[PDB]
Design a protein around this ligand. Structure first.
Ligand SMILES: [Zn+2]
Ligand SMILES: [Zn+2]
Length: 81
């Protein structure tokens, strides 16, 4: 018996927790490579390696607030304060 299918609600290849520490995303920031990293991991890692930890790309000390990403996760959803 060689059969096994998978599915879901909507194609969402979005992570749930950090990968550098494998812990709950704490103040994750979105980069040009469309990736997220703990405000601490991004800074710490950046120090040693100026590139990414997953795509190992030239970030150039760039980091954007992925606050919107976290919001979606929460039950509420959108962030309209
Ligand atoms: Zn981390
Ligand atoms: Zn990356």
């Amino acid at each position: 018996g060689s059969s096994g299918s998978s599915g879901g609600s909507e194609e969402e290849e979005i992570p749930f927790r950090c990968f550098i520490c494998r812990q709950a995303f704490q103040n994750p920031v979105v980069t040009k490579c469309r990736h997220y990293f703990c405000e601490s991991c991004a800074l710490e890692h950046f120090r040693a390696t100026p590139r990414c930890y997953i795509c190992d790309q030239p970030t150039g000390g760039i980091f954007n607030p992925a606050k919107e990403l976290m919001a979606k996760l929460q039950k509420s959803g959108p962030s309209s304060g």
